[PDB]
Amino acid sequence: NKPNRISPELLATCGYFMPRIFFLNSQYAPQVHWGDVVAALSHFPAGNLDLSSEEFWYEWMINWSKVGDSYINIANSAKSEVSHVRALRSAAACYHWAEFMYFSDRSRKIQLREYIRSCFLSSIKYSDLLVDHQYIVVDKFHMPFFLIFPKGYKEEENHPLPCVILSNGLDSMTEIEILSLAEFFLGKNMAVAIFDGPGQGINLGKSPIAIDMELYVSSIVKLLEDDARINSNLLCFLGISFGGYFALRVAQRIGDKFCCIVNLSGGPEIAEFDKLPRRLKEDFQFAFMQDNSHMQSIFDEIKLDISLPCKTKVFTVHGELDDIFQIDKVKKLDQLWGDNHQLLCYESEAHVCLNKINEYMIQVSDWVSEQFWLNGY
Amino acid sequence: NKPNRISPELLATCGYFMPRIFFLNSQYAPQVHWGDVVAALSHFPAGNLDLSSEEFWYEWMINWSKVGDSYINIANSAKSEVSHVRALRSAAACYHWAEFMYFSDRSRKIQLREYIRSCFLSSIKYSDLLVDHQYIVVDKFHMPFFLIFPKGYKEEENHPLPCVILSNGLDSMTEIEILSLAEFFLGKNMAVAIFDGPGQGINLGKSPIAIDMELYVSSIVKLLEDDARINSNLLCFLGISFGGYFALRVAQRIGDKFCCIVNLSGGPEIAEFDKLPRRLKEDFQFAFMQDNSHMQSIFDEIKLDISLPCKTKVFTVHGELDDIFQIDKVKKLDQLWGDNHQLLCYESEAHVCLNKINEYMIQVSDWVSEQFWLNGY
């Protein structure tokens, strides 16, 4: 017998995704260990290496699901609350990597996201974070919403807190990548607001993603204005990937509600749909609940009028080699938006600059603090 | 330009070490991100792949040192205490992977361990852990010692706490792997005691490692008996790798001082020195401050008399494919020590079973709690 190991061929093929799978070293957000990746991939079938192929992501979903199941079994037999929660967190992370690039069975994908959300909701009662979970009603839409307070938060010991609203992108899960990002703000005694807009979080595959996500963000801003615990004059909006595109829309439409806005590798338009790499065509199709033939028209509608002014301070982090949001379009926006837009461009980074996420989230979190301080915090 | 990535050849070669480098997802202990591994290895020279070769580990030390330096630069310009500490933690992790398998410049290795310890000591004042740091005098030896209390610990709100003493192995660093393990006990409202015996932690390359480490453990037990905050009737000793060998010695010599002992992949004797794989010959030589020709005689001295009774409950986690502490010798000890020794053996795992460390540390931490409960906690 040889020790369980990942094939070199498979590690190479997955290089783009490894920084995403490991993501940020977090306190609360679910995260894989190296051995979870070995459990998922050590017996992955050989000769299955096409990231654009349906067959690759089916086997990926099956193998990551097995690892999630193993952690649920640990959770169910756990002898302590602390062990139970650590196992639920590990399960949630594994089920997310099972589902995030799997689009072929809508019911299975929704089921995996329900497993993740059940892991999160089960874990809240044991958390040392205060989580205020509710639905925000936006016309007929009941929007899952989480307002999370820093460790050791007591309303009577605090002035009203600054708050960062963070948006999902196309294929993130709220309590995985977005809670991971949110910890950089919770760590600075800021409240955070994370949410499942249409086509986001547990709504992915249920409702189409809303291009006008700023409508839903406006409803969060109204809740935060009404909450005595939150200083609504000290708000930030952060989005990642397609959520960064939402950040640019928020900057244009309701920017005056925000001290500052962070765009983690969104852009004002998407590369040609037909030529998108990996599984991105099926990812966009799934989120918009549309077929291949309808998607370029949606991309045409998504494209921003960059002549429309941005109404607050924007910080964009972008990779020169981004193959979804091309750097040329981001640099054009940076030039046109002038002194109100700061661009951190990494020369040899792909989409979301994930080799640099620890360093750039340090810089981003301190930049947000600085903008609150500039607004009299 | 292509995105910064690790060579497939290099990822393959390093497969044994990747689970060790990523280790445990921690709250306090320094830990790398995937992008730190990319920063270290993306420009690693081609055709340098011999894990037994001095030239491999020189380039490894140089490249990881660059990543550590980059995080010190972030720490030094950090705009907040929280950002400063996260950067110091990242630097410490990187400097540890720079040094842990580098033996060719004693002064450089000691310097890197001093950087790590400076990162740790600098971080303590900002920690929400109470760290009581002192020297324990053992004859002429001044032993660095850290007694760490759980998050939110107040003596007046608590009965005297159980305490887990955790030992380094040959090439671990106290505040990296051992603090990572310790968090599983801190998370259960137990105190932990971590320490630099002779040839351990900042003493590696200064004093030879003590075979009779139980002498130093006895001095910790005396301090814990004297500390009103600690229930000295509720003590555990845990060791990892060569520290697990120390755990077996503690079980034999002072086991009656412990409710239970955990052996993470130590054994009662080491495989033949001359045939050790990778850089293990130079690792053992460095820790014992001896040349190649003296080391088999030291291995002969290390070998336990397994007929000497173990005086408490022992839990061993071991890999069938361990190439340092052979499973046959561990199974012989398990049989001879009978009902007082429990063995968790993973069929396809190498030394320390690092593909399983999250799951087995859940099980181990609950087993320790159970042993304290059996002793009336």
Ligand SMILES: O=C(O)/C=C/c1ccccc1
């Ligand atoms: O939600 C998306 O569409 C993408 C999010 C994301 C999050 C982390 C890394 C890369 C992409």
Ligand SMILES: O=C(O)/C=C/c1ccccc1
């Ligand atoms: O200190 C040693 O000799 C080895 C320790 C260790 C720690 C973590 C993983 C593998 C080995």
Ligand code: NA
């Ligand atoms: Na358990």
Ligand code: NA
């Ligand atoms: Na308010």
Ligand code: NA
């Ligand atoms: Na900073």
Ligand code: NA
């Ligand atoms: Na005591």
